[PDB]
Amino acid sequence: MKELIYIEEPSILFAHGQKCTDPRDGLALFGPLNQIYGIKSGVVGTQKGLQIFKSYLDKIQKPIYNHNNITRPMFPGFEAVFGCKWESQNIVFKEITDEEIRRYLFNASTHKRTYDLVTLFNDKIITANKNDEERVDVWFVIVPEEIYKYCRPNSVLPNELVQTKSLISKSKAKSFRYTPTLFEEFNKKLKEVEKEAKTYNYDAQFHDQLKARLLEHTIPTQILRESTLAWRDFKNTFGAPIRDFSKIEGHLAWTISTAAYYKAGGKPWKLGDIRPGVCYLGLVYKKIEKSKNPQNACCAAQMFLDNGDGTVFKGEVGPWYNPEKGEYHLKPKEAKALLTQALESYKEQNKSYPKEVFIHARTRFNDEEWNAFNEVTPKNTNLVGVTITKSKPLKLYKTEGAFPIMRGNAYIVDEKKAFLWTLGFVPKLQSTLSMEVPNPIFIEINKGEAEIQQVLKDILALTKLNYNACIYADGEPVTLRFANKIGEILTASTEIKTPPLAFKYYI
Amino acid sequence: RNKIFISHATPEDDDFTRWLSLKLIGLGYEVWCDILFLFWSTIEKEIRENTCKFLIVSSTAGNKREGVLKELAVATKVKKHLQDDMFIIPLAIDENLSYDDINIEIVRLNAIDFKKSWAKGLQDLLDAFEKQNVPKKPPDHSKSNLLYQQIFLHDKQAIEKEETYDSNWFPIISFPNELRFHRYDWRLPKQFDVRTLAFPAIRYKEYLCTFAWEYDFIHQLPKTETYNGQESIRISTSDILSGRYDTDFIRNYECQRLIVQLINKAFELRMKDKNVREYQMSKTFAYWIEKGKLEKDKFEKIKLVGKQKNKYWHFGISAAGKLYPSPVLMVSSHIIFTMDGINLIKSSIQHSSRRKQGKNWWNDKWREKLLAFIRFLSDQNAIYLNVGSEEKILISNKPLKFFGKMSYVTPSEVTLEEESVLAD
Ligand SMILES: [Mn+2]
Ligand SMILES: [Mn+2]
């Protein structure tokens, strides 16, 4: 028999210097770590969207229960939790008219459709941001259901509902260059063709395109579907709610509130016990399939300290991908550049250099980029590189009962690799964190030297800094939890020079 | 003389009672509640001689609960025996409380509205306490945290209980004594797929790494008949597993790598002459059982193929070898569907449906199905793999099992049903 260890569940600190394991319970009993005095809501959408948002704002004032309030704890109400008020009295409304939606949603091409609608929302957001001062905390994009359905990639609009036609096809759109002639009437139609063709350089999904084209303006946005806030009124042909939130309403309220609270400037919680000077860096890669080069991809880094308000550094594009082995590796230059970006940002924030630098990735680092990392690393700063995979076939089945293994159990293969059960049974909720039998993540100190148990503890603690999800704990550390999200946001605009930005502008 | 009593119906108003008790304690007040302890005479003595303010939770369940009404009657006697016009402070928390269902003793008093906002209700309660000069200590949220952790999280903690677990790692007991490299050289055609041979064999560098013999590939490779078997390099497998072997010709990590690459192919080939069908994945192969086989679709009373809606689900396994830290075969479990029990749906369908089917299975079912499948395609107490005419590997049908020092009390109330119902 092989022996497992147990890693005690890390604690998160809330208000009044109190520490706990469940952010919902800690927020309900004590309150948020940072405190703000009001959420000035900006609302973009139809009048019906504003009505739905105001109805949800009125609802979350009162308590909202779940079905099984042990697995998912109840929601006492916004003011009774955050000590703040999220009132409809402070709503700066910028209306999107119905005819405005009909003008741009019924184009045969998905890319122009999504680009036009994202532009319609973004122009309102940015104009209200600039002209009449910056007086709101978060901008809440209330997305109608039709837009969400038809402004997504691989989504076809019925030909009978098309009102405006397409001018250029998808294959030739990215190669179209507008070159003027000496015929004005001709140049007009050429400019229209270019207007349509430019949208194929953006990703045809409303969410990433809106959040990416809004990066250069630094405006917090929470995108909520109309059917998310009014799921009772979005039924099928059987009179039944399409998205049934009836048994988890409270949990929903816990998620929308906390996330909003983070985007409004306040930090709900931070890590309770962590060593000073530590800094965690999660790598992010996303292949740019638009470019002809099969190796072309975008790179980025997510920095986290003792809280979930991380920092996102956008790297350059390059042949980071190796179609051969299917692992992204960075070339020496970009390794140096990205690590220097991160370390200089750390020095600007903490006025010192990190005592340790843990680089998290899903693959094993090659020596070529690790030496470039070491070149810029200060010196008396331990720099290691950890591999978290999840795709490791090891499953432990409890010998009896339907309940699975308990979260926190860990199997240490050697002084450099171990197995961590971030998912499994958790005695607090008296339920499971995942369906079926949990798959433990595999951790390996691929490059560098450090204690295996300390890295395990740090990862387990890093599964608790998710601000969007107000849940007990996550499956993977925040350093890699939103890697695909950041990657797609960075490749959705294809026209960005973004500086180091906070998480609340991508999250 | 200064305790704050909270009468409440259990467990209908347990959430609000816990919230209010803990918040008032953290704010500095001394509250008395049966929910904060782990018997009627004690309650009576406390309301009569130690309660400064008697708060009653006014809900549909509270106004009809007999014990709550007993405590309220004692509180009425007490209130009469002092001068406190506000000794009884009802807390209206139920917006479904019909007026004709309110108890008479509560309806004649003015309650504090918690129905519109628990925050506003708490502010009003604290204002009434301040105006009544109710005794209180400076804030101490640490005591509220302590009570939350030791009273409410009592039966919800991890305990020190040794627990054994089964795994998906089935060890390999028997290994061929020598892993050999055959210097076939020109005898092996350069453009020949060394993946078509009946025994698992892979290239290294002019040699051919295999567990099989020098002449185990004559029928497919004629020229190997002229090959002198003495040119082969034979390495002790026990020296490869123990790490004793490490030369310039080949390194230990490489040795173990070619060994797993051979074990995988051996599994794939042994699956061919067996009562299982195949399912091609992104890089590996899964193996399942047709509907017609087995006694009523059950091996050892374990359903290995069954019915879902309009199709038939089949439990399947895939194998991948590893030999660090221990030589084992890791078996992953999967689900694959058929329309009639034999022919696959080639699409999404086999994904969505897998998710929708597997959500109904838990630890017991997954473990039973894996162990039952493994024992089914066994050959004794193990599963022989043919890496040669006379060499073979043996994988025990009993998996490597782990054990830990910290376990949990199994919640007899299966909430797994509530969880698996969530199929939205
Ligand atoms: Mn299109
Ligand atoms: Mn969002």
Author numbering:
A (entry chain C): 1 to 507
B (entry chain B): 2 to 39, 45 to 353, 355 to 386, 388 to 432
From the reporting publication:
To see what the structure of SPARTA looks like in absence of gRNA/tDNA, we obtained crystals of Apo SPARTA that diffracted to 2.66 Å resolution and belonged to space group P6522 with unit cell dimensions a = b = 197.18 Å, c = 183.4 Å, α = β = 90°, γ = 120° with one SPARTA heterodimer in the crystallographic asymmetric unit. We solved the structure by molecular replacement using an AlphaFold13 model of the heterodimer, followed by manual building. The crystal structure of Apo SPARTA heterodimer reveals an extended TIR-APAZ protein interacting extensively with the more compactly folded short pAgo (MID-PIWI) protein. The TIR domain makes contacts exclusively with the MID domain, whereas the APAZ domain makes contacts mostly with the PIWI domain and few contacts with the MID domain. This interface between TIR-APAZ and short pAgo is extensive (burying ~ 2240 Å2) and underlies the stability of the Apo SPARTA heterodimer in solution. The APAZ domain emerges from our structure to be topologically similar to the N, L1 and L2 regions of long pAgos and, by analogy, we divide it into APAZ-N (residues 167-280), APAZ-L1 (residues 281-352) and APAZ-L2 (residues 353-450) regions. Intriguingly, in Apo SPARTA, the positively charged pocket on PIWIA that mediates oligomerization is masked by negatively charged residues Asp306 and Asp309 on the loop. Overall, loop and helix αN appear to be key elements that maintain SPARTA in an auto-inhibited state prior to gRNA/tDNA binding.
One new defense system is the short prokaryotic Argonaute TIR-APAZ (SPARTA), which is activated by foreign (plasmid) DNA to unleash its TIR domain for NAD(P)+ hydrolysis. The resulting depletion of the essential metabolite NAD(P)+ lends to the killing of the infected cell (abortive infection) as a means to prevent the spread of the invading DNA to the remaining bacterial cell population. The SPARTA system was first discovered in 20186 and further characterized by Koopal et al3 in 2022, who showed in an elegant set of studies that the short p-Ago of SPARTA associates with a TIR-APAZ protein to form a catalytically inactive heterodimer with 1:1 stoichiometry.
